[PDB]
Every structure is written in C-alpha cells, then in structure tokens.
C-alpha cells in the first residue's frame, strides 16, 4: 500500500490493478529527483505498471528544503515488477554514487 524509502528492496504482494504509493523524499532545489531509466517519470512499461508522480513540498515551505515525491504504481499485468528509481539530475544522469530505490510489486 504504502512504501517508504524503508521499504528499498522489498517485495509487496499486490493485486493486478493495485494501487501502490512509493513516497520518497526529493529536494527540487537540488535539481535531483526521482526518475525511471532515461529520466523519466513515465513507467518502463505500461502494460506492466502504470505510474503517476506528483511532488509535495514540505510543509515548512522553507526555502531549500526537501518534500517529497510521490510515485502511484498500479501493477496492470501479474508477474513481479522492479520499480526501479534513481535520484538523479536529469541532464545529468545516473552514476555510480546515485541514490537508489527499487520495490518489486509480487502481482497476481
């Protein structure tokens, strides 16, 4: 249901056409965000998953200060699916020191 940077690894057992909400935290103010290969928002594949993203600044409304990024994944076709996301500048692109996040969806 409810997935967390905590969750990075982790396998939740999911329904086809569940609703999975990946929340991460994201600084906008650092260029950085979250993104699928090719620095995208945009599933991979979507038959297998569909995403929608949407970034909530922090509460605080502090300048500089990171919010959070959230990812709706709704798994479309059974199997076990990487959401598979790196933090990265998209002009710059991913490297070997980039935040990474990934939860397998289990679907059936």
Same mark, same amino acid.
């Given at each position: 249901?409810?997935? !967390?940077?905590a969750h990075n690894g +982790?396998?939740? !057992?999911?329904?086809?056409? @569940? ?7 994201? %600084? ?8 699928? @290969?090719?620095?995208?928002? @945009?599933?991979? %594949?979507?038959? *297998?998953?569909t995403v929608e993203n ?10 500089? +200060? ?17 959401? %598979?996301?790196?933090? *990265?500048?998209?002009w710059t692109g991913p490297?070997?020191?980039? @935040? ?7 679907? %059936?």
């Open positions: 249901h409810k997935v !967390t940077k +982790a396998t939740l !057992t999911v329904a086809v056409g @569940e609703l999975v909400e990946i929340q991460l935290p994201s %600084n906008p103010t650092t260029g950085f965000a979250w993104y699928f @290969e090719g620095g995208t928002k @945009e599933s991979p %594949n979507e038959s *297998m998953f949407k970034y909530f600044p922090p509460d605080s409304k502090l300048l500089g +200060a990171g919010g959070t990024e959230h990812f709706h994944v709704t798994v479309k076709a059974a199997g076990t699916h990487a959401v %598979n996301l790196t933090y *990265m500048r998209p490297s070997h020191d980039s @935040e990474r996040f990934i939860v397998y969806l289990k679907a %059936n």
